[PDB]
């Protein structure tokens, strides 16, 4: 679970990098589809699962909107994401394993984009939080 320290760390970092969340998302998803090719199967319903694609840029903006929501619900992510979870659970049926993948791509994006901000202390608490989100999303899987 997230500590007060953890909680203060994600908020200060989210407070710091939140401006460029639209770019963070596009780059993360891009990275996901290119490095973890297996993940494209979930976007086969699209005609163009390609880096920076028209559509790719969109779900990316989508995903980081869910990350910012998660920051604002950080004291009870499980309740804060019941809707997000019902969608990947019930509607998309995305293996939780991929949440892990995306998370590693997200750390890389932010590390590239905000190297001074992404200290090892920012990292461990942020990694604690993204694992925290993944489990909230898994909430209605089984």
């Amino acid at each position: 679970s997230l500590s007060d320290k953890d909680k203060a760390a994600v908020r200060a970092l989210w407070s710091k990098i939140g401006k460029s969340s639209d770019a963070i998302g596009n780059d993360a998803l891009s990275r996901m589809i290119v490095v973890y090719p297996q993940t494209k199967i979930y976007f086969s319903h699209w005609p163009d699962v390609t880096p920076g694609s028209p559509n790719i840029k969109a779900h990316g903006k989508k995903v980081m909107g869910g990350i910012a929501l998660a920051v604002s619900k950080i004291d009870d992510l499980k309740t804060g994401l019941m809707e997000l979870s019902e969608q990947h659970a019930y509607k998309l049926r995305v293996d939780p394993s991929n949440f892990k993948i995306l998370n590693h791509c997200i750390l890389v994006v932010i590390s590239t984009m905000f190297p001074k901000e992404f200290t090892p202390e920012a990292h461990v608490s942020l990694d604690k939080f993204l694992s925290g989100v993944a489990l909230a999303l898994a909430e209605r899987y089984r």
Partner: protein
Amino acid sequence: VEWTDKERSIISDIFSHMDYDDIGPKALSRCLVVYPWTQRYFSGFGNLYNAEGIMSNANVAAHGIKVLHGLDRGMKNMDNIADAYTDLSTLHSEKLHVDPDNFKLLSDCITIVLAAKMGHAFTAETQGAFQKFLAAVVSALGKQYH
């Protein structure tokens, strides 16, 4: 790669007495309730609403028996497992769009279902040899993914 002769005997033993018509359904039904997202690929099958339905769904039964027989090529091809699933892997990758992580999960359900059936005779060394095999096949199935 590499297999010990005893590893060879174990797998040959296990398969030689495998009741595929029994083990298949139970492993694929089992997988569908403990990893419910795997139901995503069996739309046309029908009911995946509750555990009962799944466990009494004929289509799933027929499909797990098929997926279990699938392993045969690999067992009859111990030193070239990747080549034996290259097409199966393309089938799974380009035609059906299945996420390869699910390969690991169904394997685990197979391990647990055989374990039930084999009980005490399912020794740790037996387990290791079967899992190593199930592991090779899954490396093979996810190969043509990109």
